[model samples]
Target: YKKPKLLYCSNGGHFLRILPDGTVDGTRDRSDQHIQLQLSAESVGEVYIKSTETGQYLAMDTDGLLYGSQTPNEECLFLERLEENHYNTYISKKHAEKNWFVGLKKNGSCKRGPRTHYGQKAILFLPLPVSSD
Candidate 1:
């Protein structure tokens, strides 16, 4: 499978491909890359994915707000921010829907109360395509 590039914005100004395992490659000028934007609230942010072929923008929020599209340029779809610290999104087809999940971590533990106490690693889940027959 082709690895998806990871892009994120940080204090250093839109850090792209911030991972060390070659999981991310920086492409600041290329809008077709995955991007993560930081916001004012803690443990919350926005993510965008630009389509290379069609020049469309896909927007998602970390607060469960799903299904949003750009205006004036209506390229792709976008989601809005609904609540604080909520990290869930969904994309639907005419007959089916998919769920995308996200989360936060501090000191290698989940930020949530019960999960934090269990010493489990906290990571975000973004739903991509999975092969099935």
Candidate 2:
């Protein structure tokens, strides 16, 4: 388990968020309630990104759709890699061959997994601290 932090996306300048309705999206808002997420490490470089407030796990399906899963599964496991530029890329562990990445578009929208690539700025994220939370 790791301390709560905001997964700030590089391309859109938005923060990855888990909504009260359990939707996973990217938001530009930096308010209090949207800033906390617990990244539970399951292996050396793998983790399950979960909402601190709603307790939903971040997941991606085979079709490359991003969603909030009620239970943690293989689809919830993400391989976290820190790129040379210091930004991080989260690729799906289940769809490793497809190279599905957790990404956000410049329009403040989540990118479908198969539509993402490591070299794209849309797939870059910075794990920023919540400080007080």
Top-scoring candidate (TM-score): 2
Q: Which tens-of-lDDT digit does each residue in 19-105 have in candidate 1?
A: 222123233533224333221211222223332223223333332322123322221232223322322232211112323332223
lDDT of 2 at 99: 69
Error of 1 at 77 (Å): 2.8
Candidate 1 Cα errors over 4 Å, as ranges: 1-56, 59-75, 85-96, 102-133
| 62: Cα error in model 2, Å | 2.0
Ten residues in a row with the worst lDDT in model 1? 124-133
Pairs clashing in candidate 2? none
Which residue runs does candidate 2 get wrong by more than 4 Å?
20-22, 28-35, 106-108, 129-133
Evaluate candidate 1 by giving its C-alpha RMSD to the native, one decimal.
13.9
Q: Which ten residues in a row have the lowest lDDT in candidate 2?
A: 124-133
Writing each residue's lDDT as its tens digit, candidate 2 over 46-75 gives: 766666657566666667666665666788
